[PDB]
PDB file of C-alpha atoms in Angstrom:
ATOM      1  CA  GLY N   1     119.653 132.733 193.625  1.00 44.20           C
ATOM      2  CA  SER N   2     119.500 131.334 190.113  1.00 45.66           C
ATOM      3  CA  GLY N   3     116.434 132.784 188.436  1.00 46.43           C
ATOM      4  CA  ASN N   4     116.385 131.781 184.780  1.00 49.37           C
ATOM      5  CA  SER N   5     113.496 134.115 183.991  1.00 49.06           C
ATOM      6  CA  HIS N   6     112.424 137.773 184.256  1.00 46.48           C
ATOM      7  CA  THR N   7     116.107 138.693 183.918  1.00 46.25           C
ATOM      8  CA  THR N   8     116.289 142.464 183.491  1.00 45.82           C
ATOM      9  CA  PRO N   9     119.296 144.155 181.741  1.00 46.04           C
ATOM     10  CA  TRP N  10     119.921 146.238 184.873  1.00 44.21           C
ATOM     11  CA  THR N  11     121.140 143.207 186.838  1.00 43.42           C
ATOM     12  CA  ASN N  12     124.726 144.097 185.995  1.00 41.04           C
ATOM     13  CA  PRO N  13     126.106 147.650 185.565  1.00 40.20           C
ATOM     14  CA  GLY N  14     128.377 146.410 182.797  1.00 39.95           C
ATOM     15  CA  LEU N  15     125.564 144.496 181.125  1.00 41.15           C
ATOM     16  CA  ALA N  16     123.452 147.651 181.274  1.00 41.58           C
ATOM     17  CA  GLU N  17     126.271 149.495 179.515  1.00 43.00           C
ATOM     18  CA  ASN N  18     126.489 146.884 176.752  1.00 41.86           C
ATOM     19  CA  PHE N  19     122.701 146.731 176.461  1.00 41.46           C
ATOM     20  CA  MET N  20     122.033 150.474 176.301  1.00 44.12           C
ATOM     21  CA  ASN N  21     125.004 151.105 174.024  1.00 42.97           C
ATOM     22  CA  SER N  22     123.865 148.503 171.510  1.00 43.30           C
ATOM     23  CA  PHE N  23     120.361 149.912 171.960  1.00 44.88           C
ATOM     24  CA  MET N  24     121.239 153.536 171.174  1.00 46.20           C
ATOM     25  CA  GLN N  25     123.522 152.436 168.318  1.00 42.49           C
ATOM     26  CA  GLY N  26     120.969 150.188 166.635  1.00 44.28           C
ATOM     27  CA  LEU N  27     118.038 152.514 167.261  1.00 44.82           C
ATOM     28  CA  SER N  28     119.885 155.306 165.463  1.00 46.59           C
ATOM     29  CA  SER N  29     119.627 153.190 162.310  1.00 48.79           C
ATOM     30  CA  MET N  30     115.901 152.635 162.840  1.00 50.53           C
ATOM     31  CA  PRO N  31     113.174 154.959 161.476  1.00 51.54           C
ATOM     32  CA  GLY N  32     110.808 157.125 163.487  1.00 51.25           C
ATOM     33  CA  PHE N  33     113.613 158.858 165.361  1.00 51.12           C
ATOM     34  CA  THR N  34     115.771 161.807 164.387  1.00 52.07           C
ATOM     35  CA  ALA N  35     119.447 162.276 165.325  1.00 53.92           C
ATOM     36  CA  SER N  36     118.564 165.074 167.761  1.00 58.29           C
ATOM     37  CA  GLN N  37     116.436 162.580 169.693  1.00 58.32           C
ATOM     38  CA  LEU N  38     119.084 159.843 169.629  1.00 57.88           C
ATOM     39  CA  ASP N  39     121.356 162.510 171.101  1.00 60.07           C
ATOM     40  CA  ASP N  40     119.147 162.560 174.183  1.00 59.11           C
ATOM     41  CA  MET N  41     118.729 158.780 174.302  1.00 58.73           C
ATOM     42  CA  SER N  42     122.524 158.686 174.396  1.00 60.70           C
ATOM     43  CA  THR N  43     122.240 160.740 177.581  1.00 60.04           C
ATOM     44  CA  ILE N  44     119.501 158.445 178.878  1.00 60.93           C
ATOM     45  CA  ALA N  45     121.827 155.525 178.203  1.00 63.78           C
ATOM     46  CA  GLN N  46     124.805 157.136 179.939  1.00 59.96           C
ATOM     47  CA  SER N  47     122.592 158.239 182.841  1.00 57.23           C
ATOM     48  CA  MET N  48     120.963 154.859 183.522  1.00 58.78           C
ATOM     49  CA  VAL N  49     124.270 153.013 183.192  1.00 61.15           C
ATOM     50  CA  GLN N  50     126.131 155.368 185.552  1.00 56.34           C
ATOM     51  CA  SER N  51     123.255 155.197 188.030  1.00 54.10           C
ATOM     52  CA  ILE N  52     123.474 151.401 188.162  1.00 53.93           C
ATOM     53  CA  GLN N  53     127.282 151.674 188.183  1.00 55.17           C
ATOM     54  CA  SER N  54     127.252 153.674 191.413  1.00 57.28           C
ATOM     55  CA  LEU N  55     124.372 151.632 192.841  1.00 57.32           C
ATOM     56  CA  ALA N  56     126.059 148.259 192.388  1.00 58.81           C
ATOM     57  CA  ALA N  57     129.467 149.656 193.348  1.00 57.84           C
ATOM     58  CA  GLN N  58     128.749 150.705 196.934  1.00 56.85           C
ATOM     59  CA  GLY N  59     126.087 148.078 197.499  1.00 57.74           C
ATOM     60  CA  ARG N  60     123.689 146.134 195.311  1.00 55.58           C
ATOM     61  CA  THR N  61     120.390 146.182 193.436  1.00 58.09           C
ATOM     62  CA  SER N  62     117.202 144.726 194.925  1.00 55.27           C
ATOM     63  CA  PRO N  63     114.395 143.231 192.718  1.00 55.18           C
ATOM     64  CA  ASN N  64     112.270 146.272 193.592  1.00 53.21           C
ATOM     65  CA  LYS N  65     114.767 148.493 191.781  1.00 52.76           C
ATOM     66  CA  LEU N  66     114.356 146.540 188.540  1.00 53.94           C
ATOM     67  CA  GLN N  67     110.604 147.089 188.636  1.00 52.09           C
ATOM     68  CA  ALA N  68     111.200 150.790 189.053  1.00 49.92           C
ATOM     69  CA  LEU N  69     114.115 151.453 186.694  1.00 51.24           C
ATOM     70  CA  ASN N  70     112.120 149.734 183.943  1.00 51.64           C
ATOM     71  CA  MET N  71     109.463 152.456 184.121  1.00 52.85           C
ATOM     72  CA  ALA N  72     112.025 155.185 184.774  1.00 49.94           C
ATOM     73  CA  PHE N  73     113.916 155.061 181.478  1.00 52.18           C
ATOM     74  CA  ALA N  74     110.604 154.311 179.770  1.00 50.85           C
ATOM     75  CA  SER N  75     109.327 157.701 180.910  1.00 49.26           C
ATOM     76  CA  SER N  76     112.394 159.559 179.651  1.00 50.47           C
ATOM     77  CA  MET N  77     112.073 157.839 176.281  1.00 49.76           C
ATOM     78  CA  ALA N  78     108.334 158.541 176.268  1.00 48.53           C
ATOM     79  CA  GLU N  79     108.963 162.283 175.924  1.00 47.03           C
ATOM     80  CA  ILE N  80     111.233 161.453 172.990  1.00 48.41           C
ATOM     81  CA  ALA N  81     108.772 159.017 171.444  1.00 49.71           C
ATOM     82  CA  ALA N  82     106.167 161.780 171.588  1.00 47.08           C
ATOM     83  CA  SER N  83     108.594 164.099 169.820  1.00 46.54           C
ATOM     84  CA  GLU N  84     107.471 165.170 166.366  1.00 45.74           C
ATOM     85  CA  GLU N  85     110.213 165.473 163.760  1.00 45.99           C
ATOM     86  CA  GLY N  86     111.877 163.542 160.941  1.00 44.21           C
ATOM     87  CA  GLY N  87     110.620 160.038 161.518  1.00 41.07           C
ATOM     88  CA  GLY N  88     106.871 160.261 161.864  1.00 43.55           C
ATOM     89  CA  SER N  89     104.377 159.041 164.440  1.00 43.09           C
ATOM     90  CA  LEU N  90     104.887 157.545 167.910  1.00 43.82           C
ATOM     91  CA  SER N  91     103.823 154.184 166.479  1.00 42.15           C
ATOM     92  CA  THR N  92     107.160 154.134 164.643  1.00 40.07           C
ATOM     93  CA  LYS N  93     109.024 155.128 167.805  1.00 42.41           C
ATOM     94  CA  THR N  94     108.016 152.348 170.180  1.00 42.39           C
ATOM     95  CA  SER N  95     108.361 149.605 167.570  1.00 41.02           C
ATOM     96  CA  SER N  96     111.960 150.596 166.876  1.00 45.54           C
ATOM     97  CA  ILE N  97     112.720 150.838 170.614  1.00 49.25           C
ATOM     98  CA  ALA N  98     111.377 147.307 171.031  1.00 50.51           C
ATOM     99  CA  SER N  99     113.531 145.881 168.272  1.00 47.18           C
ATOM    100  CA  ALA N 100     116.668 147.771 169.295  1.00 47.42           C
ATOM    101  CA  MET N 101     116.572 146.207 172.762  1.00 45.32           C
ATOM    102  CA  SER N 102     115.936 142.798 171.215  1.00 43.42           C
ATOM    103  CA  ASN N 103     118.886 143.066 168.832  1.00 43.43           C
ATOM    104  CA  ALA N 104     120.991 144.507 171.658  1.00 44.42           C
ATOM    105  CA  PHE N 105     120.421 141.639 174.096  1.00 47.49           C
ATOM    106  CA  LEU N 106     121.239 139.120 171.362  1.00 44.49           C
ATOM    107  CA  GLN N 107     124.677 140.701 171.027  1.00 43.84           C
ATOM    108  CA  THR N 108     125.267 140.851 174.770  1.00 42.62           C
ATOM    109  CA  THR N 109     124.015 137.605 176.312  1.00 39.29           C
ATOM    110  CA  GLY N 110     122.450 135.963 173.273  1.00 39.73           C
ATOM    111  CA  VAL N 111     119.027 135.672 174.884  1.00 41.26           C
ATOM    112  CA  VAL N 112     116.296 138.289 174.651  1.00 42.39           C
ATOM    113  CA  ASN N 113     113.611 138.982 177.242  1.00 41.38           C
ATOM    114  CA  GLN N 114     110.408 139.348 175.222  1.00 41.50           C
ATOM    115  CA  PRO N 115     108.104 139.982 178.287  1.00 42.70           C
ATOM    116  CA  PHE N 116     110.484 142.811 179.205  1.00 43.55           C
ATOM    117  CA  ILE N 117     110.308 144.297 175.705  1.00 45.90           C
ATOM    118  CA  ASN N 118     106.524 144.103 175.782  1.00 46.77           C
ATOM    119  CA  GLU N 119     106.396 145.591 179.275  1.00 45.41           C
ATOM    120  CA  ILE N 120     108.601 148.497 178.214  1.00 44.30           C
ATOM    121  CA  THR N 121     106.596 149.218 175.060  1.00 45.06           C
ATOM    122  CA  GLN N 122     103.453 149.306 177.199  1.00 44.89           C
ATOM    123  CA  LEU N 123     105.016 151.730 179.680  1.00 44.00           C
ATOM    124  CA  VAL N 124     106.502 154.046 177.039  1.00 45.33           C
ATOM    125  CA  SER N 125     103.256 154.238 175.057  1.00 45.62           C
ATOM    126  CA  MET N 126     101.327 154.849 178.263  1.00 44.44           C
ATOM    127  CA  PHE N 127     103.557 157.518 179.803  1.00 45.99           C
ATOM    128  CA  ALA N 128     103.891 159.323 176.465  1.00 45.01           C
ATOM    129  CA  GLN N 129     100.153 159.765 175.943  1.00 44.16           C
ATOM    130  CA  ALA N 130      99.543 160.455 179.629  1.00 45.62           C
ATOM    131  CA  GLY N 131     102.444 162.891 179.813  1.00 49.17           C
ATOM    132  CA  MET N 132     103.513 161.861 183.307  1.00 48.87           C
ATOM    133  CA  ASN N 133     105.473 159.307 185.334  1.00 47.97           C
ATOM    134  CA  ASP N 134     102.822 159.307 188.074  1.00 46.37           C
ATOM    135  CA  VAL N 135     103.699 162.145 190.424  1.00 44.66           C
ATOM    136  CA  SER N 136     101.336 164.774 191.859  1.00 42.19           C
ATOM    137  CA  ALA N 137      98.815 163.079 189.565  1.00 42.87           C
TER     138      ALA N 137
END
């Protein structure tokens, strides 16, 4: 039904595309990251989008998926955020990630989900320093 809150960018496979594209584009212009790392985030973008593409194509996405995919791509960016190179500390990584998503969602639907951005930045920072996505742990 109509839920005007907690809207996650993975609700629509096309929205995910627009979101992640704008994300990886804008983030490339932000500090902390190096082009070699944006190269991988490009893959993370294409991977997540295609996953949701196939998922929504032959069926649909349940709310449970949103609360899993949010920590999934956070983990794959965590390894990149913890990557040392031209850009500096991880503190500069997560802050840029946060803003990139914000600026992205403004271009796509015009409204940004701040709780989401905070949730993601918590996950990324956590998984990066823990070095795991909770498995065999």
